[PDB]
């Protein structure tokens, strides 16, 4: 034999590792200035003859992304003004809207005393607050947060628009993308390719419907940590988008109220025009057969003769019973009980979803720090594209030929999981020792 | 398609005798003990792993679908109801006696 140890430096071998990836991006809540400029032409090196064991649910890029997003939110909310004077007693009447029966109190014309530039003086001012923003103490109300937390008003110049952020690993680390299509979320992947940075991942805060995400490649893909478990949310990724047109048709004029020296409180003054209801339109002929594809792909997991039923949300917070999102700066909460009402047996009309607008937002499931989104002048309309769902099975006695699926809650780690499913971080260990005939 | 099957419907054993309670199932099975309709307690989580504070008399082993619950050196406390659980489904359990 007479083999001897030879040291090779820079061999292509890697192991699983966790590292603080940095952000590259091509005013916002997610700072474009703070992130480095992205590469003009990314490199995708295809690793032939490589099989890699991926895992969606133990991916640490999701946890790091969530921590970075929360910290960006906090950093954006830090320099803005504090609305501690606003937690006072408010005399609230109905905004003049004839008598709409139900939904009449959705806007409340509330008058309150506010502090001025001079500490010794007060001013009687008024503002239009939503019903969800206030709670009764016959006309005495207070903001809903006044016992639980304090509000910081979001800066008006700061925009909540998602920007595509690319997560690049540092030196000595590699990001392996699983180019394989129909790859569920876990286990082997024979089509692998290393990248410098991940694709543009828009941070979109949404519940029951993933918006502005990746559109898959071949077919609708269902991914859950275990299909048998009920507690695990099911992530569905569409192969074609479902367009959704969301609008807040109230003009909603904005006014400035000096609460202190150099501090302003932006408050809705008047709706110029008819008082209407915010909503979202989804195509019916698209959403049906999109649910058809989803049912066809769920029947692979749950059996061929099963009756796949879709029902609306069982209960919970407002962020989970309703599709919550942010459109142009205002926070919509849409019913979506018309979307998820179906029963599938093995064998230019729009769905209008009524949305309630909110201003006092407790983001990232945190309690103890609330935000007050300012009003927005003019009508706001947005066109987003549904690329997926979060779902939850009913469980229980599933021995029967029925399977009820309801929309799932907002953890926001499932939102990042649907985008970072293909990406894994590894550390390259360049040192190696092999046997060869050579000697010193 | 979860299925459960527990073999002893009724069970009587002497003190100091090793007992084996067979529960056949598919998936993550956990063993619990209920005494006289009072609140259960977790003996075994997963196939074999023992919870903290549980007596070492109880242990579990895994082979295929079957789990054994090898309890050794029965004592006056061990006489109680014993049942197996996979997720949301719980079969009615046996009842140790003397």
């Amino acid at each position, epitope marked *: 034999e007479n083999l001897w140890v030879t040291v090779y430096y820079g061999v292509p071998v890697w192991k699983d590792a966790e590292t603080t990836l940095f952000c590259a991006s091509d005013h916002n809540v997610w700072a474009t200035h703070a992130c480095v400029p992205t590469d003009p032409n990314p490199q995708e090196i295809h690793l032939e003859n490589v099989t890699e064991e991926f895992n969606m649910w133990k991916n640490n890029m999701v946890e790091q992304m969530h921590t970075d997003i929360i910290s960006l939110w906090d950093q954006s909310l830090k320099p803005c003004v504090k609305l501690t004077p606003l937690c006072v007693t408010l005399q609230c009447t109905n905004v003049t809207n004839n008598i709409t029966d139900d939904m009449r109190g959705e806007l409340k014309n509330c008058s309150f005393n506010m502090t001025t530039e001079l500490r010794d003086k007060k001013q009687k001012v008024y503002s239009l607050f939503y019903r969800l923003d206030v709670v009764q103490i016959n006309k005495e109300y207070r903001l809903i947060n006044c016992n639980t937390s304090a509000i910081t008003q979001a800066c008006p110049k700061v925009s909540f628009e998602p920007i595509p952020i690319h997560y690049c690993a540092p030196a000595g680390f590699a990001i392996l993308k699983c180019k394989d299509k129909k790859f569920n979320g876990t286990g082997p992947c024979p089509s692998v390719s290393t990248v410098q940075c991940t694709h543009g991942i828009k941070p979109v805060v949404s519940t029951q419907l993933l918006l502005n995400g990746s559109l898959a490649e071949e077919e609708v893909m269902i991914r859950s940590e275990n299909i048998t478990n009920n507690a695990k949310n099911i992530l569905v990724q569409f192969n074609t988008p479902v367009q959704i047109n969301c609008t807040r048709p109230n003009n909603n004029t904005r006014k400035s109220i000096r609460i202190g020296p150099g501090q302003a409180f932006y408050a809705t003054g008047d709706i110029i025009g008819d008082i209407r209801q915010a909503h979202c339109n989804v195509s019916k002929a698209t959403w049906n057969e999109t649910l058809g594809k989803v049912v066809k792909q769920l029947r692979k997991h749950f059996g061929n003769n099963t009756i796949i039923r879709f029902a609306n949300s*069982s*209960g*919970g917070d407002l962020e989970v019973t309703t599709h919550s999102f942010n459109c142009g700066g205002e926070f919509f909460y849409c019913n979506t009980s018309g979307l998820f009402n179906s029963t599938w047996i093995s064998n230019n009309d729009s769905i209008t979803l009524p949305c309630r607008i909110k201003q006092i937002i407790n983001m990232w499931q945190r309690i103890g720090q609330a935000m007050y989104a300012p009003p927005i002048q003019g009508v706001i309309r947005c066109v987003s594209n549904i690329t997926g769902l979060i779902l939850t099975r009913d469980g229980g006695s599933t021995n029967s030929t029925t399977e009820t699926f309801r929309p799932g809650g907002g*953890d926001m780690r499932d939102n990042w999981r649907s985008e970072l499913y293909k990406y894994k971080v590894v550390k390259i260990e360049p040192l190696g020792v092999a046997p060869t005939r050579c000697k010193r | 398609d979860i299925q459960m099957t527990q073999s002893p419907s009724s069970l009587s054993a002497s003190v100091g005798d090793t007992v084996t309670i067979t529960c056949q199932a598919n998936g993550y099975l956990n063993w619990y003990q209920q005494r006289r*309709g009072k*609140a259960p307690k977790l003996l075994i*989580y997963d196939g074999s792993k023992l919870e903290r504070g549980v007596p070492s008399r109880f242990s579990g082993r895994r082979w295929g679908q079957e789990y054994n619950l090898t309890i050794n050196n029965l004592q006056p406390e061990d006489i109680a109801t014993y049942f197996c*659980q996979v997720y949301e489904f719980v079969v009615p359990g046996t009842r140790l006696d003397l």
Partner: nanobody
Amino acid sequence: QVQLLQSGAAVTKPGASVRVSCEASGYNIRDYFIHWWRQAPGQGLQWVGWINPKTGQPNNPRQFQGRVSLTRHASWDFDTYSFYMDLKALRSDDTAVYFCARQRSDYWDFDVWGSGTQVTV
């Protein structure tokens, strides 16, 4: 120091709602799902449903859907959490005892169960 107290046993006529309370304290209540179990006398345990503490989302079987409501309430500082189970349409079959259990992991190991609340109809 994990502790899941439960309310006293209740008696009510059919068709009148109950309010079974389960007070959880001594641990981080938010990360662990709280499930509900129902034991008829002389019968094995049955599952009523889980509730996420963070989001408040219930999940119930088709047998109990439309009747059972799982809710949760948080005090100041969130050290004590009150999980309520309310059955709307009561019936002689529902004569069971109700436990609130704490799932700790993917295993569905219910480490801590409640004392119980005998609901008699």
